[model samples]
Target: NLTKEQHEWLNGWLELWGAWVYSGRLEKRMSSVIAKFMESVEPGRVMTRPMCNDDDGMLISQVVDSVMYIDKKAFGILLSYYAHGSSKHAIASYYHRVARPRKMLCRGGGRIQKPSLATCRREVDEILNASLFMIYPVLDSAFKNRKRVE
Candidate 1:
């Protein structure tokens, strides 16, 4: 017997959100930020859930804010993590090669220049101060387990 039906999960546990990677014709600096965040986690066992649970539109907004707030040094580390072959451009190209046609492609653009360092710092402070909900349980767990490995 052959079955044509496919199984899908709506709000299912398996439908848990996954980590974000950059998509688009990103500015070099911005792409570096995304690469660092992607590299900080162990690929085999990393949490990918959305930081907030809202409608798709709202989620996109939050992701944009997060992207904008990322610091340039962090961006540099991100670029290094994803760096392969030789040049930074190679790493950037890798992202485009694999992600361009996917469902999660980044759309439109955000302010490209890195915010004045103080502006970025303040924005992060505001988010931490104002975030009332902890939608992703694992985020708290990761914080609690923080340590400095020699």
Candidate 2:
């Protein structure tokens, strides 16, 4: 069985892998951040925020910063679930709750509508799909090793 600390570590690893796979520039940024984290590691100390700012805290913060606007509550919920190892589909539930249009408007005799659940699901799937290949091996290894990574 995996301890809570191990699970948290795995979650942080997966988040970075996903972010690195999402953008070329982000991959480069993660490379440097990862190097810094590895370099800061000592033989006897547990990894902490001071040692790896690029972990969950900063990665989630980066996501929040990248978005132009997000419902604070929904974003908080999304980050909470994500940092705890929730799947993308689960996190996307919060997206549907926040991203829906508040009011319908008619322009040029055309009605605007809030996006459907299907739309939200598709959007989330697309985002996940883009990173799936890149992160699969890491995920597979975690599962195979029972929450441990090489």
Candidate 3:
């Protein structure tokens, strides 16, 4: 499903800033940026780029996706991490451990390559972020409609 352009873009971005982006520090930085953005917003006013900076826009897309909706398996690991007081890495490791035997139920020799804990966490976050971005427009439209109704 990946296009050549997408592959190139990913490679370029990773080459330039992949380490920083993947570090949990990026999440912290984004959280602060979003908090500042929300604080600056005027109540009852529509948000625009002028009101929320480009960083805010980027953070919105990033945070909304990673912290919001997730795939079922990813969600399970996320919850387990929280509930068990384990690190995200630990939760992912657990997921890999559990997934090994269960994958046999599926096809393709039921062999799933084991992703490192960090890789698994990153993958889950990516899925979450994509889902959030995809749903954002729908959510915004619904919110606008509800506001008009009210």
Candidate 4:
């Protein structure tokens, strides 16, 4: 199914994003460089070198920036999860924590509240886990439709 392909791309993208997150604090041409680095991680994959200074990763970062601007929640949470590790179990535990039990009488005890797959799992999957069909068009268009100044 197309869903499978989408998640494959999404999963790969998350890997790319995770690498981007831990890479560094600069932005001029780093994303492109990092992308090439990622490509180098695989066999038979190589990104093009910069022809000039302007052909750096800034544009790539800008495309990402646009995605961030466009879909703040889904992609935001998506990248956050990808950059930093988070799990449904952890999210549930974090969300369901009540109060710690005391020695004699527990003032804070684990609440009856349980995390939902709908909230923590299914919702997240619906938004992020599936695949690339979500936002590639915009990025493609951003890349394809870029206006050049002559």
Most TM-score-accurate candidate: 4
Candidate 1 ranges with C-alpha deviation above 4 Å = 1-18, 22-30, 46-150
Superposition TM-score, candidate 4 onto the true structure: 0.47
lDDT of 4 by residue, 1-150 (tens): 236665565455545545444343335354443334334333443333212133323454555555554555555455445544466555434434532433342267544434444555565555554324545555456556665431
Which pairs clash inside model 1? Answer: 18-48, 19-48, 35-78, 36-78
**TM-score for each of the candidates:** 0.23, 0.32, 0.35, 0.47
Model 2 whole-model lDDT (C-alpha atoms): 0.44
TM value for model 2:
0.32
lDDT per model vs. reference? 0.33, 0.44, 0.42, 0.47
Model 2 RMSD in angstroms = 12.6
Clashes (N, CA, C under 3 Å) per candidate = 4, 0, 2, 6
Ranking by TM-score, best first?
4, 3, 2, 1
RMSD of each: 20.0, 12.6, 12.7, 10.2
Off by over 4 Å in 3: 1-71, 74-87, 101-112
**lDDT per residue (tens digit) for residues 20-66 in model 3:** 22222234354443333334334453322122333433443354435
Clashes of 4: 6
Ranking by lDDT: 4, 2, 3, 1
